[PDB]
Amino acid sequence: LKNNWVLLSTVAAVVLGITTGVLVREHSNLSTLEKFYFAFPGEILMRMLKLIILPLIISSMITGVAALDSNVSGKIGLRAVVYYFATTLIAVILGIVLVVSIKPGVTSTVDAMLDLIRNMFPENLVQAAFQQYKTKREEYKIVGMYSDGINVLGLIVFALVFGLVIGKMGEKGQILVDFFNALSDATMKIVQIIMWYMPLGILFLIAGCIIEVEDWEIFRKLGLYMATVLTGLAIHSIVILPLIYFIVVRKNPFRFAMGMAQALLTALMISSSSATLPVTFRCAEENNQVDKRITRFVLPVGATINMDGTALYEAVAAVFIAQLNDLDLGIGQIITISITATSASIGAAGVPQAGLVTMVIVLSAVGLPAEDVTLIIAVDCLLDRFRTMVNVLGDAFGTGIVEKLSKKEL
Numbered sequence: 203l204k205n206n207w208v209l210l211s212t213v214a215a216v217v218l219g220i221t222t223g224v225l226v227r228e229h230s231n232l233s234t235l236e237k238f239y240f241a242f243p244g245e246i247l248m249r250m251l252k253l254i255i256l257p258l259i260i261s262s263m264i265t266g267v268a269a270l271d272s273n274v275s276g277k278i279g280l281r282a283v284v285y286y287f288a289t290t291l292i293a294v295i296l297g298i299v300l301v302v303s304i305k306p307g308v309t310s311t312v313d314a315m316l317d318l319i320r321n322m323f324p325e326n327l328v329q330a331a332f333q334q335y336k337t338k339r340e341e342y343k344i345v346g347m348y349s350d351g352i353n354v355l356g357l358i359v360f361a362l363v364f365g366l367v368i369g370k371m372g373e374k375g376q377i378l379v380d381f382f383n384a385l386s387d388a389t390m391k392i393v394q395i396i397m398w399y400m401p402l403g404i405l406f407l408i409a410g411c412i413i414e415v416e417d418w419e420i421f422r423k424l425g426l427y428m429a430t431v432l433t434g435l436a437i438h439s440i441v442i443l444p445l446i447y448f449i450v451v452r453k454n455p456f457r458f459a460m461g462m463a464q465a466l467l468t469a470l471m472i473s474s475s476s477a478t479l480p481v482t483f484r485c486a487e488e489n490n491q492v493d494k495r496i497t498r499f500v501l502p503v504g505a506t507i508n509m510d511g512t513a514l515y516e517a518v519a520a521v522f523i524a525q526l527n528d529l530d531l532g533i534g535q536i537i538t539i540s541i542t543a544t545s546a547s548i549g550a551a552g553v554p555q556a557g558l559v560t561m562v563i564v565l566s567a568v569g570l571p572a573e574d575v576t577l578i579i580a581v582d583c584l585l586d587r588f589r590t591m592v593n594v595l596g597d598a599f600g601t602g603i604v605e606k607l608s609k610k611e612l
């Protein structure tokens with residue numbers, strides 16, 4: 203179909219990469235260095251996508267907050283925050299219920315929960331643009347250290363405050379608001395340029411992902427672990443979120459979901475929600491006909507907070523080892539895993555290796571060794587390419603609901 207060139211090219215690249223991964227792996231053998239060199243275009247595409255995160259997040263968030271009126275912004279943010287909280291709680295509850303029902307497992311926390319508050323208020327803005335803050339205790343004195351990795355939470359709250367102040371100032375801040383308004387358009391144009399090269403990177407990324415698997419034995423060893431996660435994802439994406447859309451807005455959500463499936467394909471191939479955010483803009487804001495200010499406000503905050511699938515994974519995979527590691531279920535034990543998983547879901551970054559570093563917190567919450575990550579770690583990657591879809595749907599669904607709630611004020 204004409205005018206669907208991007209979607210058709212992405213589908214063709216995906217199927218070609220799947221064919222390459224299923225063919226070249228069994229008809230040849232490559233060393234680890236050759237496997238690394240095979241996925242070089244995918245690495246270049248990832249790097250190009252990560253390059254655009256810094257100027258897009260701040261510009262879009264500042265524009266979204268300063269575009270609205272002085273009083274409407276606080277109320278809209280309140281609805282968005284409460285929506286995110288309810289969705290995360292529902293996701294954790296559903297994941298816990300499923301992992302407990304299927305029971306597939308038959309066969310330093312106070313210094314990490316405080317790091318979120320220490321990261322929301324960075325000491326230096328330029329350092330927070332490319333570095334994070336991590337604290338450790340040693341003999342027992344608290345020692346601070348700065349590690350590499352872009353800080354998104356502190357930047358996001360800084361954009362919140364800056365946009366609110368600029369909107370309050372009014373005429374004096376007009377130059378500063380037009381600057382970021384132009385920056386947002388320039389960044390969107392750059393993302394549109396990257397769209398041209400993205401299919402080839404997607405093809406090579408999929409091929410490299412299929413190649414790196416070892417013997418397919420881990421598929422059978424931890425098959426139930428994949429099954430519970432996929433069932434939870436399907437339930438959360440088909441039964442709960444469409445239900446809330448239909449209850450709030452008397453429209454069918456399936457056309458809304460299917461129209462923007464290109465963002466789903468891109469995110470699922472690149473296994474990242476923060477990096478796919480510009481694609482989420484390009485799809486939702488110009489296909490589902492949602493307000494620009496709403497998408498420039500709800501999506502940036504929900505890109506790092508609305509991580510439903512992450513929280514579901516924390517819950518299911520923590521109760522998995524709670525069953526496996528010579529332990530039994532506990533009533534208050536379920537509650538502490540739910541709370542810790544919610545906090546880690548709020549506390550996790552938008553990178554494909556996330557969900558493991560924040561996993562240690564919820565593993566130690568129930569008093570278990572930190573070395574149990576090596577259990578599901580083998581399939582932990584192959585599966586993390588499936589936790590972003592529900593995040594993208596959650597943000598897109600939230601945009602329409604918050605638009606409907608505040609239609610009069612818009």
Ligand SMILES: N[C@@H](CCC(=O)O)C(=O)O
Nearest residue numbers: 473474475554556557590
């Ligand atoms: N890949 C996830 C981040 C959390 C995780 O990897 O577990 C996302 O983009 O939403």
Ligand SMILES: [Hg+2]
Nearest residue numbers: 411583584585
């Ligand atoms: Hg992978």
Ligand code: NA
Nearest residue numbers: 286289290508
């Ligand atoms: Na959520």
Ligand code: NA
Nearest residue numbers: 504505508593
């Ligand atoms: Na998200």
Ligand code: NA
Nearest residue numbers: 547548549550
């Ligand atoms: Na998070």
